[PDB]
A paper describes a structure:
Animal coronaviruses (CoVs) CX1 (formerly named BtSY2) and BANAL-20-52 are phylogenetically closely related to severe acute respiratory syndrome coronavirus 2 (SARS-CoV-2), and CX1 is the first observed animal betaCoV carrying naturally occurring Y501 in its receptor-binding domain (RBD) of the spike (S) protein, a residue related to human adaptation and broader host range. The S protein sequences of both CX1 and BANAL-20-52 are closely related to SARS-CoV-2 PT S protein and share high AA identity (97.96% and 98.43%, respectively). Additionally, both S proteins lack the PRRA insertion on site 681, resulting in the absence of furin-cleavage site (FCS) facilitating S1 subunit dissociation. Determination and analysis of cryo-EM structures of their S proteins and RBD/hACE2 complexes revealed that Y501 shows a synergetic effect with R498 and inter-replaceability with H498 for hACE2 binding.
Numbering used by the authors:
A (entry chain C): 297 to 622, 637 to 676, 685 to 740
B (entry chain A): 692 to 1110
C (entry chain C): 988 to 1085
D (entry chain B): 741 to 789
E (entry chain B): 938 to 987
The structure:
């Protein structure tokens, strides 16, 4: 049926008919994550009593925690959530490497500027993001906390600078900025300005003039060891079987086996020339395991025509005639080409009919069955050598033969526009 | 400045002639490819690598896959028919006779040696040893590659990615048997078995027929039979010495093997390139992105890998054309140099041709050509046409020459003073 | 979307033309061989072994066919034989006669 | 001669190496063709008066 | 005059192939332009990559 589907016809002629390969299916799934028990500090990070100013923004480090963000559902409501290098539906199945958290306060109509590739006051002189950024950006309104009846002026931002900032850099200088050609030398005056300025927040001002709280998270996903992981339960380790695995957020299928290579303390998994993962270190028991594919291949099918019969024989290129390495009925024969199942070996030598390989051919004959044999080169013969004996022919024959040679092939022309656009 | 060669000159004199007093028998070697390695490719294993999300998106390119596989199948069948056309001219195996006295002629080194496996000639044994093959058969089991993880052998690497090598139909022993039958027939019956049944004839008779073929009379052999037999023995000794002394002899066959291996290895290495995708690993993409966003990257990877496979197939087709031309030339030279003696110039060896012998080789054949070359010469005086009694008399077969007082007639390829 | 389709269809056409070029090269080789066969077996008697027939050559006839040509080669083959006894020459009056 | 490009071409340098190998093979073949046609004899004979 | 045709055809074929290779640089393969300097002048790296 496989060769029928390959040929896209319901009738099949005689031949050897290379099939696809030999494949094995997984039967089990395993998950291995490091053991972390403590919940991750959401209440400290998102929910602080005070937040920093945008120019003097804050950075915090997060490690050895479990990232279960479902505990924020009854506590917080968010107005903006966007992730860049990762899909938001895959966050429950991963582990994160070098997490940091940044926090500050801006206006309502300036939250759009916290994104790569932007321009403006905040993006130019206060806070800059890299073009190749991997992480998520969160924001939510904070009018009921950061506004006072008289007006709150504790939050500050920068207004003038000679040049734009580089990504993830901070300046807290207070030197006087000069606009005209007259030198300043301190003493703010006509063309001298104090660089920093203060927001003014009131509980009755417009939506775009209301304070917002912003948190930016950055991380690397796969390479390097990780200590912050999602809320997924772990299982036991299974060796020497084809299983589906999940090592620190990396998914695949294969067979796991103990390894001899030794990793340096800052390495987690390794690759080959094809950049495929072939080794991994178990998070719980610090041991090195190898990964090997399950499918290996080498299958072909020998058949006469479907009009004649429905019997077949199958050839496996690399097997010492046992259970197929990760269906024996009665007849098993071994050849230098491989193990042949479904044919009867015969000692007699005939003319080759269907070529198998390594000097073995097959044919269909008489109750009809498929036989395999060593092909006959021809009729054995010899010539007597005798030098004092010579032989000369006394009749001859006149004969005619036939020879067939192609000369030409069909001439064709193509119109691009009609074939492509039509 | 590169030297074309030693400058020389010939002194043209219209009343002089030079005729070779002596000659040599020289044998040379010639090396020709016949077939290449046969390969087949699995698309799904090379492109998707046992992922179910992939190969559900390859249903739009299975047609291109079928086309590629069709081309490779054609190449394989072509290689088999090339071997058939080169070696399977005769269907009558001629058993090697009991080694008899051939008049000093020594085919012991070109005939099979029973005291060794496979019953093959010592020269063929040396030729088989000189060329290396990076295949070591095809029996590599799953456990063999599973256990030998530390040794990163290339065969397991290219077999885990869907690239496999199929064995040729005719084994080495069968080809040795073909060659042995050819040599036995050509040393007993001469040129007869090419056209009609084989007729027995002495070897001195057959090679005296060869001398009559080149235009040199039989008496040159007959007065010097032992000398010429020793000469041919010396020539075959020169060939054994030349083959044994210089390791750098078989280059074209080795180049064919190396080219095939390099093509497969570069196909394996080209999996590390990302064709504008975020990564070259499907597992990473499927770990980080949801399906609607992963489809774009997977599509880029699929396009690139199909392009790589198509390039490989095109190169294979062109190389197959080259090997087909070489195989046709080998078949023609076999027919015209061991089934007969050729009047063509510089075809079965430099010089006036005598005969040829085949020896088997991996992916090719080696021809030992036996030629004729005149040795040192001596100048003489001649006349345009010796007129005796007013009617211009002309010789039938030779050329009239004189020492200065007497006139003699002699042929061209060899000096024969006769009246 | 239209650009994706355009690129794919151009690739298909280029593949077709490359295969046609290779096949045309093979057919040209066959045509040259056939031309030499005509010139050397139909306009003359060839001394080449196994070129204008399986044996000693006499002649050949051409016949036309769609996209090809069929050759009828008339050949000489020796029939049944008899063994005798031979020597290099005969010494009658002391001088070898060949 | 743009630096932003050829920093993105490290993913295709392999295909470039393949193309260059093919072209070099063609060049060596052309030289061998000329030598096989014209260099049959190594003794250069000078034309007589 | 029309005697040495095949040699001239070889020369013409090679020259025409090289000139066609030069002329193919004017096509944009679904991009906004066929000039790298134009793209690098108008767009930032993450958008110029495509
Ligand atoms: C303390 C901040 C998080 C630290 C650990 C996180 C590492 C990598 C981030 C993964 C995304 C989930 C955490 C942020 C919550 C998303 C907002 C939401 O639920 O809508
Ligand atoms: C995880 O737990 C296992 C015991 O179940 C212990 O051997 C291992 O050291 C622990 N390691 C981590 C990563 O916490
Ligand atoms: C969710 O929060 C509200 C308001 O703080 C509270 O009344 C309610 O009990 C909470 N629900 C749970 C399950 O804690
Ligand atoms: C912040 O934490 C305090 C307890 O310290 C809690 O009362 C408050 O509701 C939290 N705010 C949010 C929005 O999480
Ligand atoms: C870094 O310092 C130099 C030297 O003072 C200055 O010219 C440059 O503008 C600074 N970088 C930024 C992004 O301001
Ligand atoms: C099968 O096993 C035998 C014994 O180990 C070995 O000689 C042979 O090569 C194996 N394979 C084949 C093709 O028989
Ligand atoms: C042929 O060889 C035999 C020895 O094998 C010898 O007796 C005989 O005289 C030789 N005769 C001829 C015709 O060469
Ligand atoms: C053999 O030759 C004779 C004489 O020409 C002839 O009569 C006879 O028919 C020939 N043999 C055959 C089989 O024709
Ligand atoms: C040979 O050439 C000489 C002069 O070069 C001339 O006198 C003579 O007749 C020529 N003889 C023949 C046979 O050509
Ligand atoms: C001809 O050359 C061979 C080759 O060495 C030599 O043995 C033989 O003596 C030579 N004959 C004459 C007459 O010079
Ligand atoms: C020549 O023949 C003899 C047998 O008479 C044999 O012993 C010797 O090895 C042969 N020399 C070769 C094949 O070089
Ligand atoms: C030429 O050969 C004859 C042999 O018949 C000889 O007598 C004569 O002296 C030779 N000529 C010379 C110049 O030696």
């Amino acid at each position: 049926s496989e060769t029928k589907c390959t040929l896209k016809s319901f009738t099949v002629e005689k031949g050897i008919y290379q099939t696809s390969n030999f494949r094995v299916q997984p039967t089990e799934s395993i998950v291995r994550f490091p053991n972390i028990t403590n919940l991750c500090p959401f209440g400290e990070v998102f929910n602080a009593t005070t937040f920093a100013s945008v120019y003097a923004w804050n950075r915090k480090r997060i490690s050895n925690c479990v990232a279960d963000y479902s505990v924020l559902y009854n506590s917080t409501s968010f107005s903006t959530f966007k992730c860049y290098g990762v899909s938001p539906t895959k966050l429950n199945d991963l582990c994160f490497t070098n997490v940091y958290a940044d926090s500050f306060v801006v206006r309502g109509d300036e939250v759009r500027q916290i994104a790569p590739g932007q321009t403006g006051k905040i993006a130019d002189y206060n806070y800059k993001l890299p073009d190749d950024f991997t992480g998520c950006v969160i924001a939510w309104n904070s009018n009921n906390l950061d506004s006072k009846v008289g007006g709150n002026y504790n939050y500050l931002y920068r207004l003038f600078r000679k040049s734009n900032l580089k990504p993830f850099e901070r300046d807290i200088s207070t030197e006087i900025y000069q606009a005209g050609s007259t030198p300043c030398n301190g003493v703010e005056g006509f063309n001298c300005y104090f660089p920093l300025q203060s927001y003014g927040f009131h509980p009755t001002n417009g939506v775009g003039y209301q304070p917002y709280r912003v948190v930016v998270l950055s991380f690397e996903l796969l390479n390097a060891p990780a200590t912050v992981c999602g809320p997924k339960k772990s299982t036991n380790l299974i060796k020497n079987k084809c299983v589906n695995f999940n090592f620190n957020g990396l998914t695949g299928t294969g067979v796991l086996t103990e390894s001899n290579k030794k990793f340096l303390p800052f390495q987690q998994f390794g690759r080959d020339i094809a950049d495929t993962t072939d080794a991994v270190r178990d998070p719980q028991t610090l041991e090195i395991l190898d990964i090997t594919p399950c499918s290996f291949g080498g299958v072909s099918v020998i058949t006469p025509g479907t009009n004649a019969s429905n019997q077949v024989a199958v050839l496996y290129q690399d097997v010492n005639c046992t259970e197929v390495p990760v269906s024996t009925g009665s007849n098993v024969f071994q050849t230098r080409a491989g193990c042949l199942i479904g044919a009867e070996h015969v000692n007699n030598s005939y003319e080759c009919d269907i070529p198998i390989g390594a000097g073995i051919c097959a044919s269909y004959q008489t109750s009809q069955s498929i036989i395999a044999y060593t092909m006959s080169l021809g009729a054995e013969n010899s010539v007597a050598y005798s030098n004092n004996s010579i032989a000369i022919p006394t009749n001859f024959t006149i004969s005619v033969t036939t020879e067939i040679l192609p000369v030409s092939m069909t001439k064709t022309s193509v119109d691009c526009t009609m074939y492509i656009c039509g | 400045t590169m030297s074309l060669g030693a400058e020389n000159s010939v002194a043209y004199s219209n009343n002089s002639i030079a005729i070779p007093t002596n000659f040599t028998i020289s044998v040379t070697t010639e090396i020709l490819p016949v077939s290449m390695t046969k390969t087949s490719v699995d698309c799904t294993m090379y492109i998707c690598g046992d992922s179910t999300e992939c190969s559900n998106l390859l249903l739009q390119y299975g047609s291109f896959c079928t086309q590629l596989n069709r081309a490779l199948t054609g190449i394989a069948v072509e290689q088999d028919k090339n071997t058939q056309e080169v070696f399977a001219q005769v269907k009558q195996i001629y058993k090697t006779p009991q080694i008899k006295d051939f008049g000093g002629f020594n085919f012991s080194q070109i005939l099979p040696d029973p005291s060794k496996p496979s019953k093959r000639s010592p020269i063929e044994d040396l030729l088989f040893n000189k060329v290396t093959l990076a295949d070591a058969g095809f029996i590599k089991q799953y456990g063999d590659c599973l256990g030998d993880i530390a040794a990163r052998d290339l065969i397991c690497a290219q077999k885990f990615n869907g690239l496999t090598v199929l064995p040729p139909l005719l084994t080495d022993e069968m080809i040795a048997q073909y060659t042995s039958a050819l040599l036995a027939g050509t040393i007993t019956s001469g040129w007869t078995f090419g056209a009609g049944p084989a007729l027995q004839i002495p070897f001195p008779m057959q090679m005296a027929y060869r001398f009559n073929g080149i235009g040199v009379t039989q008496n040159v052999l007959y007065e010097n039979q032992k000398l010429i037999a020793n000469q041919f023995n010396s020539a075959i000794g020169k060939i054994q010495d030349s083959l044994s002394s210089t390791p750098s002899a078989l280059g074209k066959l080795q180049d064919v093997v190396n080219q095939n291996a390099q093509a497969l290895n570069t196909l394996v290495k080209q999996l590390s390139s990302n064709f504008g995708a975020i990564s070259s690993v499907l597992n990473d993409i499927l770990s980080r992105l949801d399906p609607p966003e992963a489809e774009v990257q997977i599509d880029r990877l699929i396009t690139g890998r199909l392009q790589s496979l198509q390039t490989y197939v095109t190169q294979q087709l062109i190389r197959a054309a080259e090997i087909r031309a070489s195989a046709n030339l080998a078949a023609t030279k076999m027919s015209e140099c061991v089934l007969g003696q050729s009047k063509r110039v510089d075809f079965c060896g430099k010089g006036y041709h005598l005969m040829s012998f085949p020896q088997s080789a991996p992916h090719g054949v080696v021809f030992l050509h036996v030629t004729y070359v005149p040795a040192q010469e001596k100048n003489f005086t001649t006349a345009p046409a010796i007129c005796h009694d007013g009617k211009a008399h002309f010789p039938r077969e030779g050329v009239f020459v004189s020492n200065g007082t007497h006139w003699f007639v002699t042929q061209r390829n060899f000096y024969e003073p006769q009246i």
